[PDB]
Amino acid sequence: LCASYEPESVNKFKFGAASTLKRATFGDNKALLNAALHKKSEPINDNSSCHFFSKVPNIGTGYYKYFIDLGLLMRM
Amino acid sequence: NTITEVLKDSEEDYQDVYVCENCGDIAAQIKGINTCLRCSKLNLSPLLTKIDTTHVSKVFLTQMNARGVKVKLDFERRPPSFYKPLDKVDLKPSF
Amino acid sequence: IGNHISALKRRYTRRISLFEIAGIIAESYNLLQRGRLPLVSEFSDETMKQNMLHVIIQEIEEGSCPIVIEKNGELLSVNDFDKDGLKFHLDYIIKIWKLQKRY
Amino acid sequence: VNEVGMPAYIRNTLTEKIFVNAFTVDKVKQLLASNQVKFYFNKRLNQLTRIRKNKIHLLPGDWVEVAVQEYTSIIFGRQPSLHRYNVIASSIRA
Amino acid sequence: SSFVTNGYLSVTLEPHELTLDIKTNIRNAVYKTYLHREISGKMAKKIEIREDVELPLGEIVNNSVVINVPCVITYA
Amino acid sequence: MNQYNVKYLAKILCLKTEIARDPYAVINRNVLLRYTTDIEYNDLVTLITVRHKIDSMKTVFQVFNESSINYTPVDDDYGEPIIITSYLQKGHNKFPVNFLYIDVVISDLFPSFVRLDTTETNIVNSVLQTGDGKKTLRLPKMLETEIVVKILYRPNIPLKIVRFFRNNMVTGVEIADRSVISVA
DNA sequence: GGACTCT
DNA sequence: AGAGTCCAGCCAATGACA
RNA sequence: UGUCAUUGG
Ligand SMILES: [Zn+2]
């Protein structure tokens, strides 16, 4: 609540950088309209935005990106 | 991964859906060719990216388009990354 | 001194927890379940006569696990982490898998 | 505390997935020969088929769905889910 | 117009294609998704898979692998 | 400015004197055990004499109202007039009237803070680096029009990070950092 | 019924 | 100082009715 | 396909 320069309540998003899908999932009916007015371009890094686009959240095992090293398969 | 597989649509209900990177809506297959009608009427030929989202996500985006809000998705053309070997690290204390 | 802090944080990157080893095991198990080639030594038909979790753990301790995890801007194999941490978490995972009758 | 008892109507209705690969192709062929397979998903044609003899070719990536067996992890819970110990995942017992 | 460059082509492999027949599947994927197709003005005619440089790490998605293959690309 | 809200300002000016003799000191109410004030109150200018106990160094502050400012430097002066303004203004010597309604330095809610030197600032900036490329974490924010930033002010040392020593019921003291952002 | 905002 | 606007736990189960 | 009534944890 005191992560910005002023105490912020649990009802609104005033200073914290919250995405439009986070504000719409929290409950704000004019969130996408205000994002369309101000032409907002937001990255998808939160749970409410990851569940919309069927992305794995950045929580727990989804905190890391996983690759496969095809070197040992191509070597033999 | 558990909550991802729960909240997303079933693996049996999969179909190749393409989205337009310029205007944001679902591409169409006219007679085998993935086209965007809005951009072929506007004399463009933009990128079409395959997406794997839920059907309710597409219904929500199309209804927000019907309200007038254009929703345009951008995709990660990530630079190709290479695994390099790392040195040995021992985290045991020294007594 | 900023180089010293960067070295300390690069040494801190080698810590492994249950989330990282569970994600590595889940990625390799999902890839092996859909038909990827098991990258174990002594490849035979007998290796397709045992269960797949034994193959995953053998790939982990043999150093031939194909999964690379991106953590703190670095790319780590499962053998780039602390060996005692990998052993500490795999002992617990093998214990609870033996309670579940799947290992 | 690591287990949960499942009634017979649930495990007679609920199904579990067995993927087709190099490890489980003999078990899937044995379960298809004994009519224990309920569903079959063909991933390359991307379609599900309910088995009520037809022709099914088992490629890696396809799966079958049979009755759910013991020591399978079910995710069970009570409502309201006030904290994370409400929704756990333990092993099915008959 | 028509020229020859050194680029990357990003394709998707299924996990059953990560066998000992892997580069045949990579060649078939590159030839089906990128050969004889117009992608934003440029149109590659015949593509040769460059196989003297390190293969990059394969990024894992929900059920597939996304690899960026280095290639000699003849555009037209 | 009245005869009551000048003693609280005198307690503030002990901390300003401590910062003026050492910019990297830890400021809390315990600093008040090392100083001694003497107040000469008048409705035009109030003279506050802060004396260091062991070093016998004197500093005379001249406290004015915002309207009537008649500032000429006395000997052993601070070098800048202390102005009691009506509202919160930008300036290290301009204290608003709301800051002096109560005794603020002796309170339990008065923080414990330092200005970081270049070594500790470099350590904090390299800790905040996420390791991936040039990306960086941010510290939580704090406005420049705050009594901590007014106390910690030095004329040619820009104050960017303030380290706070929080009270902690289970660990004693906790370390936090705020970043000072600009106003007007 | 009750809290935030514009008037 | 006073009206507008939005907000009021989760998951159920039957029956009647439009 | 939604309302109303009654009930459960
Ligand atoms: Zn278009």
SS3 assignment, position D49: strand
- Show Cβ contacts of residue C45 under 8 Å, excluding neighbours closer than 6 positions: none
Inter-chain contact C35–E57, Cβ cutoff 8 Å?
Answer: no
Does the CB of A7 sit below 7 A from strand G? no
- The answer to whether E72 and E51 have CB atoms below 8 angstroms apart is no
Calpha distance D90→D72 (Å, rounded): 8
Query: What's the number of domains chain F is made of?
Result: 2
Q: Coil, helix or strand for F38?
A: strand
Residues D6 and F94: their CA atoms lie apart, in Å, by 73
Tell whether the torsion through CA atoms of B47, B52, B55 and B59 is positive or negative: negative
Question: How far apart are the C-alpha atoms of C84 and F17, rounded to whole Å?
Answer: 54
Query: Quick one: DSSP state of residue B64?
Result: H
Per the structure, the complete domain to which residue F148 belongs is given by 106-184
- F177 CB-near residues (< 8 Å, 6+ apart): F116, F124, F139, F140, F161, F162, F163, F164
Residue D59 touches chain E, beta carbons under 8 Å: yes
Distance CA F108, CA F170 (A): 17
Could you tell me if D35 and D54 are in contact, meaning their C-beta atoms sit under 8 angstroms apart?
no
Give residue B49 CA to ligand 1 midpoint distance, Å.
Answer: 11
The number of residues making up chain D comes to: 94
Q: Are C40 and C64 in contact (CB under 8 A)?
A: yes
What Å distances lie between residue C85 and C15, C17, C54, C78, CA to CA?
7, 7, 19, 11
The dihedral built from the CA positions of residue C87, C93, C95 and C98, taken in this order, carries a sign that is negative
Could you give the 3-state DSSP secondary structure of residue F184? coil
Angle at CA of residue D81, ends D80 and D86, nearest 5°: 120
Per the document, the length of chain C is 103
Count CB neighbours of F87 within 10 A. Answer: 10
CA distance F110 to F106: 7
* Cα four-point dihedral sign D70, D74, D79, D85: positive
Nucleotide nearest to A14 (CA to C1'): G4
Pairing mode, if any, of strands F141-143 and C74-76? unpaired
User: Which of the nucleotides lies closest to D80 (Cα–C1')?
Assistant: H10
Size of interface A-C (CB pairs under 8 A): 44
Residue B20 burial by Cβ neighbours in a 10 Å radius (0-12, 13-18, 19+): buried
**CA trace torsion F32, F34, F38, F41 (10° rounding):** -30
This structure was determined by cryo-EM
Q: Please report the DSSP string for F43-65 in residue order.
A: SS-EEEEEEETTT--EEEEEEEE
Query: Residue E52 sits in which domain range?
Result: 1-76
Let me know whether F94 and F119 are in one domain: no
F115 and F124 in contact (C-beta within 8 Å)?
Answer: no
Side chain identity at D15, as an amino acid letter?
T
Burial class of residue B83, CB neighbours in 10 A (0-12, 13-18, 19+): buried
> Do F179 and F132 belong to one domain?
yes
Q: How far is the CA of B69 from the C1' of I1 (A)?
A: 28
> Closest approach of chain E CAs to the CA of C37, in angstroms?
5
Radius of gyration of chain B (CA): 21
Task: Please name which of F4, F25, F43, F12 lies closest in space to residue F112, comparing C-alpha atoms.
Answer: F25
Contacting residues for A26 by C-beta, under 8 A, at least 6 apart: A13, A18, A48
Q: CB neighbours of D81 closer than 8 A, spacing ≥ 6? A: D87
Residue E48 and residue E75 in contact, taking contact as beta carbons nearer than 8 Å = no
> Which helix (H) or strand (E) segment is D41 a member of?
strand D37-42
Cβ atoms within 10 A of the Cβ of A65, count?
A: 18
Q: Which of F105, F134, F153 is the last residue of a domain?
A: F105
- Residue holding tokens 């008892």? D5
The answer to whether some atom of strand H lies closer than 7 Å to the beta carbon of D80 is: yes
Nearest nt to the CA of D79 via C1' is H11
* Structure tokens belonging to residue F93: 């010597």
Residues 6+ apart with CB under 8 A from B89: C11, C14, C80, C82
Whether residues F90 and F115 share a domain: the answer is no
**CB-based contact, D61 to chain C, within 8 Å:** yes
On whether the CB atoms of residues F43 and F2 are closer than 8 A, the answer is no
Q: Do chains F and C touch (3 or more CB pairs under 8 A)?
A: yes
Q: Which two tokens stand for residue A16?
A: 């914290």
**3-state secondary structure string across F60-122:** EEEEEECCCCCCCCCCCECCCCEEEECCCCCCCCEEECCCCCCCCCCCCCCCCEEECCHHHHH
Can you tell me the distance from the alpha carbon of B23 to that of B44, in angstroms, rounded to the nearest whole number? 11
Distant-in-sequence, close-in-space partners of A40: CB < 8 Å, separation ≥ 6: A20
Q: At what angle do helices C18-33 and C52-62 cross, to 10 degrees?
A: 120
- Say if residues D49 and D39 touch (Cβ distance below 8 Å): yes
F12 and F45 share one domain = yes
What count of other Cβ atoms lies within 10 Å of the Cβ of residue F80?
Answer: 14
Q: 3-state DSSP: chain D helix, strand, coil percent, rounded to 5?
A: 15, 40, 45
Number of domains forming the structure of chain E: 1
Are F78 and F61 contacting, i.e. CB atoms less than 8 angstroms apart?
yes
Tell me the three state secondary structure of residue B34: strand
DSSP H helical segments within chain C, as ranges? 2-12, 18-33, 52-62, 83-99
Cα separation of D82 and C45, whole Å? 49
Question: Which tokens is D90 given?
Answer: 């333990």
Characterize the bridge pairing of strands F82-85 and F58-65: parallel
CA distance B66 to B58: 12
Structure tokens at F107: 């309170």
Q: Give the count of Cβ contacts less than 8 A between chain C and D.
A: 27
Beta bridge partners of E69: E9
Q: Which of F90, F105, F120 is the last residue of a domain?
A: F105
d(CA F113, CA F131): 28
Measured from Cα to the C1' atom, the residue closest to H7 is: A27
Nucleotide nearest to A12 (CA to C1'): G4
A11 touches strand G (CB under 7 A): yes
Rounded Cα distance between E2 and E75, Å, is 5
CB contact under 8 A, D48 and B15: no
Confirm if F57 and F21 have CB atoms less than 8 A apart.
yes
What is the sign of the dihedral through the CA atoms of E51, E56, E62 and E63?
positive
Q: How far is the CA of B34 from the centre of ligand 1 (A)?
A: 11
CB contact under 8 A, E16 and C31: no
- F108 contact partners, CB below 8 Å, separation of at least 6: none
The helix (run of H) or strand (run of E) holding residue D19 is strand D15-19
Looking at the structure, tell me whether residues F4 and F95 fall in a common domain: yes
CA C37 – CA E15 distance, rounded (Å): 9
- Which structure tokens are listed for C22? 């569970």
When CB atoms are compared, the residue of D20, D60, D71 closest to C101 is D71
Q: Which two tokens stand for residue B95?
A: 């007594």
Ligand 1 centroid–CA B45 distance in Å is 7
| One domain for residues F154 and F86 | no
F110 and F86 co-located in one domain = no
Edge-to-edge strands, sheet with D3-5: D3-5, D87-93, D73-77
Burial class (CB in 10 A: 0-12, 13-18, 19+), F113: buried
Number of Cβ within 10 Å of residue F19's Cβ equals: 19
Backbone angles phi, psi at F77, to 5 degrees: -80, 160
Domain end, chosen from F46, F73, F105, is at F105
What would the two tokens of residue C36 be?
């990827």
Residue by residue, what is the 3-state secondary structure of chain E?
Answer: CCEEEEEEEEEEECHHHCCCCHHHHHHHHHHHHCCCEEECCEEEEEEEECCCCCCCCEEECCCCEEEEEEEEEEEC
CB contact under 8 A, C37 and E18: yes
- Say which residue the tokens 């944001």 belong to: B24
Residue of E3, F78, B6 whose CA lies nearest to A54:
B6
CB contacts under 8 A, B 32-71 vs A, are 52-54, 57, 60, 64, 67-70
> What number of other Cβ atoms are within 10 A of residue F102's Cβ?
11
